[PDB]
Scaffold this motif. Structure first.
Motif, PDB file in Angstrom:
ATOM      1  N   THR A   1       0.675  -1.337  -0.033  1.00 38.85           N
ATOM      2  CA  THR A   1       0.231  -0.147  -0.046  1.00 38.85           C
ATOM      3  C   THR A   1       0.799   0.835   0.100  1.00 38.85           C
ATOM      4  O   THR A   1       0.422   2.285  -0.396  1.00 38.85           O
ATOM      5  CB  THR A   1      -0.503   0.352   0.810  1.00 38.85           C
TER       6      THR A   1
ATOM      7  N   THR B   1     -10.072  10.575   4.736  1.00 39.10           N
ATOM      8  CA  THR B   1     -10.037   9.610   5.266  1.00 39.10           C
ATOM      9  C   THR B   1      -9.269   9.741   6.937  1.00 39.10           C
ATOM     10  O   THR B   1      -8.697   9.931   6.777  1.00 39.10           O
ATOM     11  CB  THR B   1      -9.933   8.263   3.998  1.00 39.10           C
TER      12      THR B   1
ATOM     13  N   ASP C   1      -9.815   3.967   8.974  1.00 37.12           N
ATOM     14  CA  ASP C   1     -11.238   3.719   8.205  1.00 37.12           C
ATOM     15  C   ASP C   1      -9.896   3.514   6.616  1.00 37.12           C
ATOM     16  O   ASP C   1     -10.639   2.632   5.991  1.00 37.12           O
ATOM     17  CB  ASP C   1     -12.038   4.618   7.980  1.00 37.12           C
ATOM     18  N   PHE C   2      -9.366   3.689   6.146  1.00 39.10           N
ATOM     19  CA  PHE C   2      -8.318   3.306   5.057  1.00 39.10           C
ATOM     20  C   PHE C   2      -7.997   2.382   5.198  1.00 39.10           C
ATOM     21  O   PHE C   2      -7.893   1.423   4.695  1.00 39.10           O
ATOM     22  CB  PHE C   2      -7.258   4.794   4.778  1.00 39.10           C
TER      23      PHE C   2
ATOM     24  N   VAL D   1     -10.387  -0.659   4.259  1.00 37.76           N
ATOM     25  CA  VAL D   1     -10.906  -0.907   3.190  1.00 37.76           C
ATOM     26  C   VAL D   1      -9.886  -1.319   2.756  1.00 37.76           C
ATOM     27  O   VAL D   1      -9.842  -2.339   1.795  1.00 37.76           O
ATOM     28  CB  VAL D   1     -11.394   0.703   2.940  1.00 37.76           C
ATOM     29  N   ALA D   2      -8.398  -0.923   2.560  1.00 42.01           N
ATOM     30  CA  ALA D   2      -7.654  -1.441   1.777  1.00 42.01           C
ATOM     31  C   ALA D   2      -6.854  -3.340   2.599  1.00 42.01           C
ATOM     32  O   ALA D   2      -7.001  -3.917   1.126  1.00 42.01           O
ATOM     33  CB  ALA D   2      -6.009  -0.903   3.173  1.00 42.01           C
TER      34      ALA D   2
ATOM     35  N   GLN E   1     -12.987   1.310  -5.093  1.00 45.18           N
ATOM     36  CA  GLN E   1     -13.925   1.005  -5.241  1.00 45.18           C
ATOM     37  C   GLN E   1     -14.814   0.799  -6.236  1.00 45.18           C
ATOM     38  O   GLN E   1     -15.459   0.607  -6.094  1.00 45.18           O
ATOM     39  CB  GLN E   1     -14.569   1.789  -3.738  1.00 45.18           C
TER      40      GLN E   1
ATOM     41  N   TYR F   1      -9.142  -5.200   0.127  1.00 44.85           N
ATOM     42  CA  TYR F   1      -8.910  -5.427  -0.478  1.00 44.85           C
ATOM     43  C   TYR F   1      -7.572  -5.881  -1.296  1.00 44.85           C
ATOM     44  O   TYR F   1      -6.913  -5.956  -1.662  1.00 44.85           O
ATOM     45  CB  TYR F   1      -9.078  -4.052  -1.856  1.00 44.85           C
TER      46      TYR F   1
ATOM     47  N   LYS G   1      -8.328   5.036  -2.032  1.00 42.69           N
ATOM     48  CA  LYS G   1     -10.104   4.730  -1.558  1.00 42.69           C
ATOM     49  C   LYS G   1     -11.337   4.471  -2.730  1.00 42.69           C
ATOM     50  O   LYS G   1     -11.570   3.507  -3.215  1.00 42.69           O
ATOM     51  CB  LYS G   1     -10.555   5.228  -0.392  1.00 42.69           C
ATOM     52  N   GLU G   2     -10.874   5.479  -3.063  1.00 43.95           N
ATOM     53  CA  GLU G   2     -12.069   6.071  -4.376  1.00 43.95           C
ATOM     54  C   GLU G   2     -11.373   4.985  -5.987  1.00 43.95           C
ATOM     55  O   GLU G   2     -12.665   4.065  -5.982  1.00 43.95           O
ATOM     56  CB  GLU G   2     -12.009   7.511  -4.821  1.00 43.95           C
TER      57      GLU G   2
ATOM     58  N   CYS H   1      -4.805   9.403   0.818  1.00 41.60           N
ATOM     59  CA  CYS H   1      -5.739   7.657   1.254  1.00 41.60           C
ATOM     60  C   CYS H   1      -6.999   7.771   0.569  1.00 41.60           C
ATOM     61  O   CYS H   1      -7.678   7.031   0.229  1.00 41.60           O
ATOM     62  CB  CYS H   1      -5.340   7.457   2.415  1.00 41.60           C
ATOM     63  N   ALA H   2      -7.486   8.430   0.589  1.00 37.57           N
ATOM     64  CA  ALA H   2      -8.683   8.997   0.250  1.00 37.57           C
ATOM     65  C   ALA H   2      -9.305   8.894  -1.601  1.00 37.57           C
ATOM     66  O   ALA H   2      -9.842   8.560  -1.855  1.00 37.57           O
ATOM     67  CB  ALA H   2      -9.968  10.451   0.647  1.00 37.57           C
TER      68      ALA H   2
END
Ligand code: V2M
Ligand code: V2M
Lengths: 298, 299
Positions: free
Chosen positions: B199, B223, B227-228, B231-232, B271, B235, B267-268, B263-264
């Motif tokens: 990452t 983020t 919270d990141f 999600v990481a 997703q 995935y 994340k996008e 990071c945001a």
């Protein structure tokens, strides 16, 4: 497949620095000659609008500082050939490999040894685009870095670095100082022609896929070279030359798939797309592996 | 921005060929020692299940043929360190660079000099994957090829090549002969642990994309670190630590993009996908540039 550079050691031993005033760049020391971009003789103000012939008149042998590391090489003559300067030095480089100067064609790949102040920094593989740019990685001070191929310990030098275009791609000369493409060595924003996909390399990629058992795309048809070329250009693909057909010879023989049969298969991929399928794991056709690169990896 | 290897010259001068019986591979010649994979003492029969101490005791110095180009180096002693064989020679390599042996951590990158019959063939950048494989390019006869970094004239050797898994990825040891990962030098089909994505490296690469005038993937969102990381992990990305956030400091300062803002963006990307778009020419999120790699090339 990895983009693989050649081992750089035989070229590292040839890199020097050339300074004229406060202007420093890289040079290539082979036997008793150092080759470098001629704009080393310019002041920043002179690079805006240079008259090379006049700038060189005001220069003598003793205006050129050539250094291997911190060791000065005495310059005993100088001359200009197109956009390169040739400085005769009083010491033959003991590390000079067997070598040739070659001018490459679009689609051919080569290794670039990026250098700063005569010190090698990194090595990577580049492909000459059809619009005669390379997608390099160069910072301030990189001019005079060279591109090369190695065949049985013979180093074929094909590129010397000069310029970053406003789009961020790079332009340069062969080792006789002749630019690839329409560019000139002056401090101006220059633009390259629209680029195209390197058809011969896409075909090499398809052969590589067949070698590795990934052959869904082989179709039942065939084509003439002229018919293929006319279709290819409607998709922004380069036309094939006779030389491209011949460098696909070994891969065609290895796989039993005629070159024009593979062209017919690619023509379907262009028209119909891939349909969510992949080739060698990718949805994108790769155009920066030459037929030689595929033979080296496979 | 390009995958860029270190100049290989300092290593090329160290590569030799080592032969025992009908087994040949590459070795690394530093001062008066040649380092090479120990399975060179095995006949192809042997590799099926070798008892290395038992096999090495039965070999003599003269069973080892070491060639540096055309010249034969005389072996005068030998010893084993884990999976690496150490052949003492009567000649010091005059081209030995300043060097160190290091064991690298997952996520770190190094340059590979692929060799065959003691002759260097190609150079390229690899990362040590979180599952301790590397995605290399190695054919028959490549064993003993090495991986390294260079730092102001000093070569840090970190990898010696030993195996190609059935999946096509590669496995090897450090220069003390300890494998990276759960692998063993026997001729068997071996699987790796499930791989994950590095990452911190993907984030470094996005910073590189911005420095080359691609800001398309950026967004207005933010983020938190936790919270990141949630999600990481979903995935199959490695967690991002605060140390990673700190290593990303310089790239954040040059671009003015806060780490958690990037990071945001990631994340996008995770997703929604990249939607047919490319970043630095890649249709995929690239995880084999470290934050150091990005700085060195972009600066
Ligand atoms: C050399 O190192 C010069 O010694 C330098 C290498 C580039 C710097 C950034 N990365 C590189 O690849 N080359 C130049 O600076 C050249 C010099 C010319 C050949 C005299 N100039 C450019 O590459 C250049 C000038 C301009 C420009 O002006 C006006 C506008 C836009 C782009 C641009 N590139
Ligand atoms: C070396 O060069 C050996 O000297 C060789 C390098 C690989 C060959 C093809 N590509 C490479 O990277 N290494 C091996 O052949 C090793 C030898 C071991 C460590 C004793 N073996 C393998 O890589 C190997 C064995 C098997 C296998 O068995 C049965 C089944 C499936 C995969 C596999 N890989």
């Amino acid at each position: 497949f990895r983009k693989m550079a050649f081992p750089s050691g035989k070229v590292e031993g040839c890199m020097v620095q050339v300074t004229c005033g406060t202007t420093t760049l890289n040079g290539l020391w082979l036997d008793d000659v150092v080759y470098c971009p001629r704009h080393v003789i310019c002041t920043f103000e002179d690079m805006l609008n240079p008259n090379y012939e006049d700038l060189l008149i005001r220069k003598s042998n003793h205006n050129f500082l050539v250094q291997a590391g911190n060791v000065q090489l005495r310059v005993i003559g100088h001359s200009m050939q197109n956009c390169v300067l040739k400085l005769k030095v009083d010491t033959a480089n003991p590390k000079t490999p067997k070598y040739k100067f070659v001018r490459i064609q679009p689609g051919q790949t080569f290794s670039v040894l990026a250098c700063y102040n005569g010190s090698p920094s990194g090595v990577y593989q580049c492909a000459m685009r059809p619009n005669f740019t390379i997608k390099g990685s160069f910072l301030n001070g990189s001019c005079g870095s060279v591109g090369f191929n190695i065949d049985y310990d013979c180093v074929s030098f094909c590129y010397m670095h000069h310029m970053e275009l406003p789009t961020g791609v790079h332009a340069g000369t062969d080792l006789e100082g002749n630019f690839y493409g329409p560019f000139v060595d002056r401090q101006t924003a220059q633009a390259a022609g629209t680029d195209t996909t390197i058809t011969v390399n896409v075909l090499a990629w398809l052969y590589a896929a067949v070698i590795n058992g990934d052959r869904w795309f082989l179709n039942r048809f065939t084509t003439t070279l002229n018919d293929f070329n006319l279709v290819a250009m409607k998709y922004n693909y380069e036309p094939l030359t006779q030389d491209h057909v011949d460098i696909l010879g070994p891969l065609s023989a290895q796989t039993g798939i005629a070159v024009l049969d593979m062209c017919a298969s690619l023509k379907e991929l262009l028209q119909n797309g891939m349909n969510g399928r992949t080739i060698l794991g990718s949805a994108l056709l790769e155009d920066e592996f030459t037929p030689f690169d595929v033979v080296r990896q496979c």
